[PDB]
């Protein structure tokens, strides 16, 4: 979805001069406008140039204007990356996050995901997904896509996972898992909860919430159970986890507040009961695929509007600059 | 009267120095984690913040992994959570991120507060921003997290004195004298102060 | 003398020789010395118990009140004294101390019982 964007509007097409200016600004320890950065981003037309731009971005991030790094600039950068290589450099930036200060909580992410899908690369995609999760996102319908990707990854990834990875997986499951419309979403959520529960029990409660959008409160297994029950009112992995748990420093929890390692048999029983109920009443990848096939009516008008707004803003900025020059 | 020009000049110079080469707080809010001391100053931290220092995070660092520097978000102090049943947090309206720090963190930030689920209009500058007792509140279960629903005797002698005075005046008045703490509020010790009023090193 | 905004304090002061402590309760500047100058002297306190077991304390309550109004803080001993008088409430620290003492006594009693 490229040709809607490629009316960028014209500016200066000399990068060396811009670079020099930037250096001078930094030499003096003076601030830099966002506009210049945007222009720089626009200009790029080589891998060396891309590298240079990256550096410049980093510098900006470490300056009196850490903020003002506008969405539009980020978008432009992403586009540039896509045009050239994309899957190493953008990813790297995302990983760095705080240093390049890119924070593209937008359709950019979706685009990136799509690109990744187009040229296989699974690990990278997973990483991207994780990064997105770490950022507070998931108002848009890319959530489904993310979930699908996660599922795909899981379909390959079937070992002991390990500390960070399990947590990441759980996070991925959870935040995109807000799909009240279908039982698949609920299942995903449950799975996520189970993973998180496992993490809690093996290692610690702090291990779960430390860096993630996740909440300190102890009952994760309980929460999962509740969620499951809700569905009934209106899994294998979870069972396995439970079984494992059953099989044979500071304290955030209280003396009165009961320890969840000493609530296991009861929990297991509850789970069993729930399962029975489900059976009485009455694959994941397939479901996800089906979902994908349905739905997906896009956000293109909105995107266009946003672009227009950005353009307007740019124009305003230019005008301001002109005024300043006149004054000078 | 002689004029002390030199002294004045010196003072001016000092002021200038303060204005200019003042430590951008990347330097002086740093922490060596293994020895639990500090660059620039050299002094240790107190014992009752060692574990906390080790295994939890700065506010600004937390913010640093968000778009717009998490300008429209909730955020909590771990201590508050430990202490109170009630929901206790700030929401942001601004960030002053100290740029000199590699992986941006440390500086200043602020917005609206609510201690024990009682909000305040207007945005102060918020205290304890460089402490390590902080946690970020996710947007999922944000509204789940934020859920909320007189008179005393005088001391022995004063009261007696008052009574005596009354008697002297003339009136008998069997109604006893009493003081009222409806006016006198008791904002707790863990209630935060204001960074506008404090001075930086 | 000009100090850096030192608050006012109603405080004790040693007016005694060695081994005879005698006290002077006094409204003074926080950053003044102990036996140095003051704003207005108030009621002298004696800690050593005089003839027939009295430990006498003066207080110009009328002027103490005035001082308090004018925004003069109280040192802990002063507060305790006030509490004792009935002018202030019993300082909770005193109460806690008393409790501790009681506990100690109880313990001692228990020990004695055990012995016997």
């Amino acid at each position: 979805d490229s040709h809607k964007w490629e009316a960028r509007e014209k500016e200066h097409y000399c990068l060396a001069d811009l670079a020099s200016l930037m250096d001078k600004t930094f030499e003096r320890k003076l601030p830099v406008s966002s506009l210049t950065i945007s222009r720089l981003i626009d200009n790029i037309s080589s891998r060396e140039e891309i590298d240079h731009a990256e550096y410049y971005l980093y510098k900006f991030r470490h300056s009196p204007n850490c903020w003002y790094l506008r969405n539009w600039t980020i978008h432009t950068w992403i586009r540039q990356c896509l045009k050239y290589d994309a899957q190493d450099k953008a990813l790297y930036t995302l990983v760095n996050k705080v240093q390049y200060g890119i924070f593209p909580d937008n359709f950019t992410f979706n685009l990136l995901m799509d690109s990744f899908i187009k040229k296989e690369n699974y690990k990278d995609a997973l990483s991207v997904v994780f990064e997105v999760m770490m950022q507070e996102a998931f108002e848009v319908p890319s959530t489904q896509l993310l979930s699908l990707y996660v599922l795909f990854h899981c379909l390959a990834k079937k070992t002991d996972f390990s500390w960070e990875e399990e947590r990441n997986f759980g996070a991925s499951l959870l935040l995109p898992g807000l799909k009240q419309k279908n039982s698949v979403g609920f299942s995903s959520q449950l799975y996520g909860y189970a993973l998180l529960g496992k993490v809690e029990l093996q290692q610690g409660l702090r291990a779960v919430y430390h860096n993630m959008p996740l909440i300190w409160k102890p009952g994760y297994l309980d929460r999962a159970l509740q969620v499951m029950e809700k569905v009934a009112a209106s899994e294998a992995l979870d069972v396995l986890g439970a079984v494992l748990k059953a099989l044979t420093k500071l304290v955030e929890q209280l003396d009165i507040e009961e320890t969840e390692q000493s609530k296991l048999p009861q929990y297991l029983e509850r789970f069993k009961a729930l399962h029975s109920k489900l059976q009485a009443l009455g694959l994941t990848t397939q479901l996800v695929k089906e979902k994908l096939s349905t739905c997906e009516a896009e956000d293109i008008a909105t995107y266009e509007q946003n672009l227009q707004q950005w353009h307007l803003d740019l124009v305003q900025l230019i005008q301001r600059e002109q005024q300043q020059r006149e004054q000078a | 009267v002689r004029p002390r020009l030199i002294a004045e000049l010196a003072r001016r110079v000092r002021a200038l120095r303060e204005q200019l080469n003042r430590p951008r707080d990347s330097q002086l809010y740093a922490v060596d984690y293994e020895t639990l001391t500090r660059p620039f100053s050299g002094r240790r931290l107190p014992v009752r913040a060692w574990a906390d220092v080790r295994r939890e995070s700065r506010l600004l660092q937390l913010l640093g992994r968000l778009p717009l520097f998490g300008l429209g978000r909730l955020v909590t102090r771990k201590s508050w959570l430990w202490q109170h049943d009630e929901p206790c947090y700030w929401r942001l309206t601004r960030v002053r991120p100290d740029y000199t720090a590699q992986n941006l963190d440390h500086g200043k930030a602020w917005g609206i507060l609510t201690f024990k689920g009682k909000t305040e209009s207007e945005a102060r500058e918020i205290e304890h921003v460089m402490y390590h007792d902080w946690r970020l509140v996710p947007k999922h279960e944000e509204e789940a997290f934020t859920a909320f629903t007189a008179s005393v005797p005088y001391p022995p002698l004063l009261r007696a004195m008052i009574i005596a005075e009354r008697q002297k005046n003339g009136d008998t008045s069997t109604e006893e004298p009493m003081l009222n703490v409806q006016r006198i509020r008791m904002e707790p010790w863990d209630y935060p102060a204001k960074q506008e009023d404090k001075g930086r090193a | 003398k000009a100090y850096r905004g030192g608050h006012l304090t109603i405080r004790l002061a040693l007016g005694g020789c060695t081994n005879r402590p005698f006290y002077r309760i006094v409204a003074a500047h926080n950053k003044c010395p102990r036996d140095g100058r003051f704003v207005e002297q108030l009621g002298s306190y004696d800690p050593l118990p005089n003839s027939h077991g009295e430990k006498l304390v003066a207080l110009n309550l009328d002027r103490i009140r005035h001082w308090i109004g004018c925004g003069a803080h109280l040192s802990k001993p002063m507060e305790k004294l006030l509490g004792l008088a009935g002018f202030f409430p019993l300082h909770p620290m005193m109460i806690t101390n008393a409790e501790r003492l009681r506990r100690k006594r109880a313990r001692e009693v228990l020990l004695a019982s055990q012995k016997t």
Partner: peptide, 29 residues
């Protein structure tokens, strides 16, 4: 105190604590 408060206190001062009585006596020989 209510037990919750006590628990909280304990949590706060994990390593540094003392075992205690409830109320004190009401006499002292």
């Amino acid at each position: 105190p209510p037990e919750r408060e006590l628990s909280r206190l304990r949590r706060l001062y994990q390593g540094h604590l003392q075992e205690e009585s409830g109320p004190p006596p009401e006499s002292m020989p």
